[PDB]
Amino acid sequence: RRYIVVAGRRNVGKSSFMNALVVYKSMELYPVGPVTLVDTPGLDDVGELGRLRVEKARRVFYRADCGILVTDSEPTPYEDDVVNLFKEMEIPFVVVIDVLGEKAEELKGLYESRYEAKVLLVSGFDDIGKTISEILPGDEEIPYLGDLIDGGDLVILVVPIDLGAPKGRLIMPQVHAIREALDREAIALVVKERELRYVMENIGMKPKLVITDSQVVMKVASDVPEDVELTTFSIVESRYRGDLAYFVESVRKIEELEDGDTVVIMEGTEDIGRVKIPRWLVNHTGAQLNFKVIAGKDFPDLEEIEGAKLIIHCGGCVLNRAAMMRRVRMAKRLGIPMTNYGVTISYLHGVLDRAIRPF
């Protein structure tokens, strides 16, 4: 479902608005579809000097898709705070009886001066679901390869090992790399490592990009004559279709691990994460780390991962990017570093070269 939060100092006047245009209340809203609305009874208790309990707030705010600030009076430090926390966590938001006629019109323009969308209380809702859809994050879909990485007439090389796809088939990352290169009017050349140096010596084109499997990148590292020819791999490309920038930043936090630090493995027969990874993390750091294995369909509760020093998400678990971003965003909001199998495994050997797309 979609998560929307309803904050505000007001108690009775807040609960009234919620129930408008029909605790968490799950109800269908057009054109956004199903959504669940949760208010802030824990946050109702206004802090010292009329402030909002920020650390108690960021405990309930972290998992919101978007936000709502329902207000009766003029902006107090409470309304100022809630807004800053939405802005910090990058949670998109909107600001919302007929008392003080024309002042309500003023208030709409008063709350509009702090650079955000203000809608008026009706006791009008056609515009509630309408604005929610417009502030909500969009498609957020990036091209398989880099936007300017491949142009027309460019040779791209795909270097496979021993395909895991059945007889007369190739794995989806490969074919998608052939298609995107073709869509961008470039040339796709697929060849096994064994015959790589031969294609590098017989063709005339210098490869713009070269892609291969994490298994044989080192062999390819030697087959490509220099740092001049940009090499990366099918796992970093797929990892790219998520949040590479955050992940790459988060792997570099492996060094920052001390004894007793908790590293969470998020997956969902003696798998890489349950066993093989921990082993490498301990071997690479020397640290007496402990690991929480979260095998669930959706992202865990705050109580299940609060205090974790790193989150290792599974690579090819195949969710919607937007459903994976929701996960990245939450981790980014809780300040917990998050990466995935692909980036970690690559980090251990040669990740820096795999990073061909600069920030």
Next chain:
Amino acid sequence: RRYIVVAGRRNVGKSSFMNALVVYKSMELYPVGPVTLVDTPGLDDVGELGRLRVEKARRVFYRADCGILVTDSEPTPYEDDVVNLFKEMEIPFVVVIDVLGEKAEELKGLYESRYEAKVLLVSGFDDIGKTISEILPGDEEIPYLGDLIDGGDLVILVVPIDLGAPKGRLIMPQVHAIREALDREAIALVVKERELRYVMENIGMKPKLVITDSQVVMKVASDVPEDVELTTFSIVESRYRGDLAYFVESVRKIEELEDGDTVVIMEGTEDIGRVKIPRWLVNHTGAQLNFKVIAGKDFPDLEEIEGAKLIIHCGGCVLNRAAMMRRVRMAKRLGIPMTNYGVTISYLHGVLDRAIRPF
């Protein structure tokens, strides 16, 4: 199901054997599975000089997977004939009370001297289904590309137009051509026609094979410098996985068409076969041809296609090769020439070049 025929001059002694180890009789037999057995009551009436009614026989024999010749006495011209018709139609077969003890053992060796498998009457059946499976046609699967067409270090070029496969995908014939080339340690290069001449001038390798769509073969015909570079197309390759030799032979029979000749279209929104084809066939020959459109799941009855001068089967209807061979074999047996959309369409423009695999 599997079709097996039970022939022989004998009437009561034939019907007895059939009913052994439990008109068409459909029953499960190990290890061949489900099969239907049909005898020859129409053929029971022995012809002039003890002969078999050959033209009446080849009317019921054409659709058999394999054959059975049940006999009581010594080989008469009837037993001689049935055998020759099985041999002609290439229908694989086996030869089958305890009367004339040891003579039955002799008979087994007498019927064995005419170069075929003889099994003895039991009134022993473990060996019936056992032999049927061994004579029955095998896998009959050929490699996607030519067996010796591509070896290691060989460049193969796949030239697409505007893919009919959804976003981030390629059509199955293409990917299977990438895989087979990779399996054979060759190099697959995929590029649009627009950038073809550029790859032909910048790379060092001479392409062993070049594959493309029937739509742009002519453009490629010009982009490939000579007859020295072997060009063909994804449709001829797929047509190859059927009976290319027979098809190619059968298209050349387009010229042999006169006014009144019936051309059958076998398919199963204003499709190519129902309309577009007939139009071309009439335009290319000038002949006043008529067309029977057989839209069925399985191959039609003899009465539905007897007298047809050509059968145009559908190209990408996706059946098992062995289930398509069964169709080719039947047409080959009835002496009706058979081809498919792919071969006809290609015949109209440039099929001869597409034929890179010699007989």
